[PDB]
RNA sequence: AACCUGGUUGAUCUUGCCAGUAGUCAUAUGCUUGUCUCAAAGAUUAAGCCAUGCAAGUGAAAGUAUAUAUAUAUAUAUGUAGAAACUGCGAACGGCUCAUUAAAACAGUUAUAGUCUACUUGACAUUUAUAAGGAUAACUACGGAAAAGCUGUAGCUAAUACUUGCAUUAUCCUUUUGGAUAAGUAUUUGUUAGAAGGAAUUAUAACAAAGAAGUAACACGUAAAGUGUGUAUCAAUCGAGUUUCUGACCUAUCAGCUUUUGAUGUUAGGGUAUUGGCCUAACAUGGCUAUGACGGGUAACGGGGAAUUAGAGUUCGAUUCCGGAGAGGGAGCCUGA
RNA sequence: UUCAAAGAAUCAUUCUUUUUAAAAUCCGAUUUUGUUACUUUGAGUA
RNA sequence: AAAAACCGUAAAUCCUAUCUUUUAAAGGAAGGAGAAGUCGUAACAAGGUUUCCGUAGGUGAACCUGCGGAAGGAUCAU
RNA sequence: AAUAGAUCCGUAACUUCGGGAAAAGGAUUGGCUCUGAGGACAUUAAUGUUAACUCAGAACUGAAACGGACAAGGGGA
C-alpha cells in the first residue's frame, strides 16, 4: 500500500532541529497536532536536545510519564509532541516557564519568562469562520479554534489568549506601525516595525519591515506575526532582541571578548 | 479505470507503467429502473457511503414558481435527452423527463390559496391542462445512482414547451 | 434562437421566478463584457456567465484555429536559452482553450486566458479578453514576443 | 599548474592522426603488505532459481476472566496477578531492487473556487433508566483426515463485539421580571436573500421537501472536581489523488500521424472522493507535426548530486536523501481512513 | 523622436546633489504619465 | 448459502499478419593480410602515346579508344 | 468434397504503377418489437397534409440458427 509515512530519516528531519548526521539514522516525526512539523519541535528533543534534561528518548518518556510538563497549562504526555511556534512550556517539578520563539538564526529557544507572563499567549488568527447562527470563530497559527470573537479582529490580526480560560484578552492589528516577528522566511526571527505593505492582486502579498537600526527586509505575509504596537512587543524577547547583524560584524564582538 | 490508456493529445500512444490503482476505481453503473422502493449501499473512499437506487416509485417533487416541494409517485419516463434506450427501458437518471401525479399539487393548491408568502402567482393555462388531465410533466433533478432518491421540479413555460415539442410538424 | 441542440442549459443561478440574466465579475482586473452581461446565449463553462471559476495564472497567446465549437487552439511563443551556446532559440507550444460566445475571435488575435478547473480532456484555459490583430500568413508562422 | 613530448623525411616546415602523460566516491585483476583511524561491498550478467532459520506485533489505572494462583479482619469484602480466547490498534510504516518508463516519471513553479484524509489537537450536538435484548469465542464431551496456521456436532457464558432505548433550549412583547412562540448534524432537491476572497452558485440566513449518522445502557481515580475509550460536525495537523507553466539522451536509411476500436470538441447523463472521453448516447470534424509529430534505440528510473575542470565544457548518477515503480509474469478482489 | 547647466566633499582630478516641455493632483507650491525582452534587487528556497 | 444468467474487468491459450534481433546454406562476388609465385609495364622524367575528369564502348591484366572538359603541363611569352 | 451471396474489416511478393485483388485471411447474417436518417405539397420566422424502399443502431427471442431450400470462387509457393 501507500499510506502516510511514519518514519522521518534524519537528514530529512527540518534544518533547525540541529540533529547530527551520526547520531542514528531516524529523527523523531512529530505527532499531528497544533502545529505543522515544519514550524515546530517535538518535545522529545525540546527538552532532550536543547534543555539536556534527558540524554535519551527513554529518559525522554520517563520525564513525560510524570504529569510534570505542561504545554499551555495543560499537561501533555505523547513523546513527539509538537510544541510549536510560540507558546508556553512550564516544568512543575523544577518550577520553571518557558516560551517557545525563535532566534535570529531561525532556530526553536525556550526563552526563559516569569510566572505572571505564562499566562499571556500569543496566537495569530488565520480564519475567521462563520458557522450556524451567525457565530464567529477565529482559526489561529495554534491551530485553536477561539468562538465568539470580538468582530473588530480581522484574519492578520493577533490575539492575546489566556490559558487558564481560553479567552480573548485583547487584539492586536497590523497597521504600519505594528511591530511583528517573521517566522519562516531569510529573516526568520528578526522583529521590526512594517514599513509597508504591498497587496498584489491573486499574489503572494509582500510586506516590508524597518528593525531598530533602519534596515529594511521584506517577506511574505503570510509569514509574518504581530507580537505589539510601536510601543512595546506584548511578550519579551530573547537576548539578541530580535536584532539580526551582518556576519562581517557579529566576528568582531565574537572576537572581544 | 480512469486516467491513463488513452491516446496523447497529439495521437500518440503512452506506453503503461504504474498498474491500476485502487483510487481510479471506476463502478459500474446503475440503471435505475421504476419499480418498488429498493437501494443499495456503496463504500466509497474514506467510508463514506453512496445511495445506489435500482428502482424508485416516488420522489420529492418542486413546484418551482411557487418554491413548494411535495412527495408524488413517479408514474412514467417520457424523455431524455442521452440515449433514447433509457426511456424505452424506463430508466431513472438526472436530466430526465417523467409523468408524475399531480393531485398532491392540487389539493395543496386548493387548501392554501382556495380555489381550483409571495402568494397570487396567476399560474398558466399548459401546465393548468395538464393539472385537468391529473398527470404532470416533470425534469429530474437529483441523481438516483449517487444520492438514491429520484427527486425533480415540474417544468413550465418555455421549457415545458420545448420538451412537449420534442417529445410530440411532429409525430 | 437562445438554444437549438438538444438542451436549453439553465443557467445555474439565472433564476426565473422570484428574484427581486446571470453573470459574475472574473476579477483580477478583467472586465465581464457587455456581450456577456446582455446576450441571450447560455453558456455552462463561460468565466462570465457559467459554473467555471478563474483561478491559476494568466497567459497570453495567438489564436491559432476556432475551427471546433465554443474552443480555440492559442500558440505561445517563447525563447529558450541554450546555455552552453550562450544564445536562444525559438520555441512554441499550442495549449486548448474554451472560448465564450460572448468573444468574436479570430485566428491571429491576441487572447488573454485565465487556468480553470479540466474543462475537458485537453482544456483547462478559458479566455477572458480580446483585442483585434490583423495577420498576414498562416497564423502559426507569427512569432510575437508574449 | 590555463603545460606538452616520441613517431611520416636524406634533411625541413605543415596538416593529421597513433603513442606517450595525469586524474577517476571506476570496476576487475596481478604481485606485495608491519600499525591505527575511517568503511564501499551480488547494481552491471540472470526483476534468474531458491533448502533452512529469522524479518509485526501489541495489555504495569483504565473493554471482556469462577482456566488458575496468591494475600489481608473474619464462608464473607477487598485485592494482586493471570495461560487461552473474543474485542481494539497496527501490520498500507519500514526494508529491498531498478525490470518497466522518452513530455511518461522527476524537478522547480502553481491550483484544488474540482477532492479524500485514521491517529493526534481545538472547538463542541439535532426529529426498565437505582440501566434493556440474544449469540458467540475461549472451555467441556464425541470426532474425521497420510498431512496443513483444516476443522463438524452438542452445551453454556461475557464484553468499549452485535443490537435497542430514558428532558431541554432558543425567540416576542409590556420594559431584574410574567405570560406568549418555535424546535434534524452532515448530505440531496426546488425557490430566495447574501463577514471573507481575486473572482462565489462563498460563509451564513429564510421558505418547501427528503434525511444518514449521532448526542455515553462503557471502564479507572486527581485537588491538602480528574482520566481513559467512543461519538455528529467544523477547524487544525499527518498526508494523498488529480492539476498549471517550464525543463531530457541518440536516431529522418522514422514525414506525416490520430480518427470504425475516443481521436479533438459540444450537449446530456453515468461513474468517481472530486474535475475530466474517465465511460455512454447524440452531434460536429477536429487535434499534433521539419520549433521533428508519429515511430525506432537506450547496455535509460528521475532529481539532490559525482568525476574532470583556468573559463567554457565532456562524461557519469543501480547505490545514504526525495519522488516513482515492482514483489516470478499478468489480471481480479476483500478488509480497511 | 529629451539635450545640459549649476552646487559640497578624496587628489591637481575624481565623486555627491537640484531643475529643464505638456496632460490630470493639491491655494505660488504640493506628483503619475506604453508592452516585452534584457538588466538590478528581493521573496520562496530540504 | 450453493447454483445459474447478463453487462463489465479480464488472465491465459491458439490461429493469422507484421515488425525486431540472431542465425544455417550449394553457389556467386568483394576487401584485407601473407609468401622470393606467374604475366605484362599502366603511373612517377615529354615515364617513352603528357596526365587527369565526366561519359560510352572494347580488351587477360594493368588498360585502350571516341566526345566534351581541366592544368594539378611539358606553354604565364610577337 | 471443400466457401462460394451480401455487408464490414484486412490484404503480401512482384509490377509495364494500370494491376496483382474476390490476393491471403477474419467477423456478421433469422424472426420480432422499436429508434434514427434520407422528400414533396401553404399560410400570414412560425403551424398542417402526404410517398417511396434504402441504410444505420438497440432490445427481446430460439436445441447457437439464420446467403437455412435455390443460387453460389478453393486458395497459396
Known amino acids: 500500500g501507500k499510506g502516510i509515512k511514519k518514519h522521518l530519516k534524519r537528514v530529512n528531519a527540518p534544518s533547525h532541529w540541529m540533529l547530527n548526521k551520526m547520531g542514528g539514522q531516524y529523527a523523531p516525526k512529530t505527532s499531528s497536532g497544533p502545529h505543522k512539523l515544519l514550524e515546530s519541535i517535538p518535545l522529545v528533543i525540546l527538552l532532550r536536545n536543547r534543555l539536556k534534561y534527558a540524554l535519551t528518548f527513554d529518559e525522554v518518556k520517563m520525564i513525560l510519564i510524570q504529569k510534570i510538563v505542561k504545554v499551555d497549562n495543560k499537561v501533555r504526555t505523547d513523546c513527539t509532541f509538537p510544541v510549536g511556534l510560540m507558546d508556553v512550556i512550564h516544568i512543575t517539578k523544577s518550577n520553571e516557564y518557558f516560551r517557545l520563539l525563535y532566534d535570529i538564526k531561525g532556530r526553536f529557544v525556550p526563552h526563559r519568562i516569569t510566572n505572571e507572563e505564562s499566562k499571556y499567549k500569543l496566537c495569530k488568527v488565520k480564519k475567521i469562520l462563520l458557522r450556524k447562527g451567525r457565530l464567529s470563530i477565529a482559526v489561529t497559527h495554534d491551530g485553536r479554534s477561539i468562538p465568539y470573537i470580538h468582530p473588530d479582529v480581522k484574519v492578520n490580526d493577533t490575539v492575546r489568549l489566556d490559558l487558564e480560560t481560553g479567552k480573548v484578552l485583547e487584539h492586536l492589528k497590523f497597521q504600519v506601525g505594528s511591530l511583528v516577528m517573521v517566522t519562516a522566511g531569510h529573516s526568520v526571527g528578526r522583529v521590526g516595525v512594517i514599513s509597508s505593505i504591498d497587496k498584489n492582486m491573486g499574489t503572494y502579498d509582500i510586506i516590508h519591515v524597518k528593525d531598530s537600526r533602519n534596515k529594511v527586509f521584506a517577506t511574505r505575509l503570510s509569514n509574518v506575526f504581530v507580537i505589539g504596537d510601536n510601543t512595546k512587543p506584548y511578550i519579551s524577547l530573547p537576548r539578541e532582541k530580535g536584532i539580526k547583524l551582518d556576519i562581517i560584524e557579529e566576528r568582531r564582538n565574537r572576537l572581544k571578548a | ?171 | 434562437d437562445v438554444q437549438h441542440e438538444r438542451a436549453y442549459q439553465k443557467q445555474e443561478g439565472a433564476s426565473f421566478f422570484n428574484s427581486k440574466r446571470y453573470w459574475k465579475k472574473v476579477g483580477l482586473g478583467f472586465a465581464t463584457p457587455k456581450e456577456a452581461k446582455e446576450g441571450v446565449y447560455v453558456d455552462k463553462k463561460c468565466p462570465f456567465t457559467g459554473n467555471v471559476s478563474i483561478r491559476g495564472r494568466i497567459l497570453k497567446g495567438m489564436v491559432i484555429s476556432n475551427k471546433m465549437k465554443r474552443t480555440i487552439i492559442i500558440r505561445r511563443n517563447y525563447l529558450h536559452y541554450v546555455k552552453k551556446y550562450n544564445r536562444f532559440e525559438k520555441r512554441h507550444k499550442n495549449i486548448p482553450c474554451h472560448c465564450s460566445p460572448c468573444f468574436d475571435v479570430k485566428e491571429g488575435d491576441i487572447v488573454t486566458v485565465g487556468q480553470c478547473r479540466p474543462l475537458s480532456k485537453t482544456v483547462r484555459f478559458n479566455v477572458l479578453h480580446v483585442e483585434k490583430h490583423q495577420i498576414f500568413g498562416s497564423a502559426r508562422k507569427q512569432f510575437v514576443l508574449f
Open chain 2, 1 to 171: 479505470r480512469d486516467g491513463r490508456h488513452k491516446l496523447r493529445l497529439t495521437g500518440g500512444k503512452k506506453k503503461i507503467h504504474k498498474k491500476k490503482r485502487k483510487y481510479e476505481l471506476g463502478r459500474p453503473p446503475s440503471n435505475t429502473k421504476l419499480g418498488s422502493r429498493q437501494v443499495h449501499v456503496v463504500r466509497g473512499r474514506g467510508r463514506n457511503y453512496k445511495y445506489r437506487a435500482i428502482k424508485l416509485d416516488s420522489g420529492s417533487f418542486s413546484w418551482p414558481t411557487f418554491g413548494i416541494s411535495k412527495n408524488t409517485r413517479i408514474i412514467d419516463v417520457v424523455y431524455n435527452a442521452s440515449n433514447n434506450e433509457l426511456v424505452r427501458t424506463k430508466t431513472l437518471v438526472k436530466n430526465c423527463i417523467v409523468v408524475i401525479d399531480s393531485h398532491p399539487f392540487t389539493t395543496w393548491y386548493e387548501n392554501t390559496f382556495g380555489t381550483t408568502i409571495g402568494k397570487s402567482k396567476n399560474i398558466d393555462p399548459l401546465l393548468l391542462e395538464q393539472f385537468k388531465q391529473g398527470r404532470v410533466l416533470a425534469c429530474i433533478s437529483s441523481r438516483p445512482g449517487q444520492c438514491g432518491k429520484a427527486d425533480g421540479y415540474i417544468i413550465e413555460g418555455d421549457e415545458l414547451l420545448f420538451y412537449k415539442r420534442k417529445m410530440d410538424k411532429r409525430n
